[PDB]
Amino acid sequence: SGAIYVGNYRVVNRHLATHNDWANLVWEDSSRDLLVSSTTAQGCDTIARCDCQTGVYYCSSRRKHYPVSFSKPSLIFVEASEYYPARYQSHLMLAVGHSEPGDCGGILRCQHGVVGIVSTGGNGLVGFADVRDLLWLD
Ligand SMILES: C=Cc1cccc(CC(=O)N2CCC[C@H](C(N)=O)C2)n1
Ligand SMILES: [Zn+2]
């Protein structure tokens, strides 16, 4: 679990969005596993606007942060799950690192700000949904 709080927006994994996120829907994209909802309170976070390929992510299944080298956002095949059919997820970045299903929502940050959130993983890999291209969040 986890979310990004920027301005009057809350960014979460689309597959983990609550009834309240859907009732205050701003934008969603199944192909990116992202959903953005509106908030009444002003958020705590700032978004990176950069091309960093190194950063640090929070891994809830280890209660720890780990440094990572990650690939550029791209279209990656993701096997079927209880949440989505087998499909290509876009704007996804992969890295070598530990992750388990409940780790989705953990923030990936570089020196410039928030880069994205954990969205996929398995077998020593961790995948992050990029948010740096969503300029309207600012
Ligand atoms: C087994 C490790 C692991 C680590 C991290 C996450 C997962 C689960 C996973 O990747 N899913 C299920 C939820 C929706 C995801 C998607 N973006 O399509 C795909 N599994
Ligand atoms: Zn950066």
Nearest Cα to Cα of residue 47 among 33, 36, 31, 62: 36
Domain count, the chain: 2
| Pair 133, 69 in one domain | yes
Known binding-site residues equal 50, 52, 110, 112
Question: Which residue owns the Cα nearest ligand 1 atom 12?
Answer: 81
Determine contact, residues 100/121, Cβ cutoff 8 Å: yes
Resolution in A: 1.5
| Pair 23, 39 in one domain | yes
| Pair 7, 63 in one domain | no
- One-letter amino acid identity for 58? Y
Between CA 94 and CA 34 the distance in angstroms is 16
| Pair 96, 114 in one domain | yes
Nearest Cα to Cα of residue 133 among 61, 67, 74: 74
17: domain range?
Answer: 3-44
Substitution candidate for ligand 1 out of 79, 120, 125 with most atoms within 8 A of CB = 120
| Pair 26, 75 in one domain | no
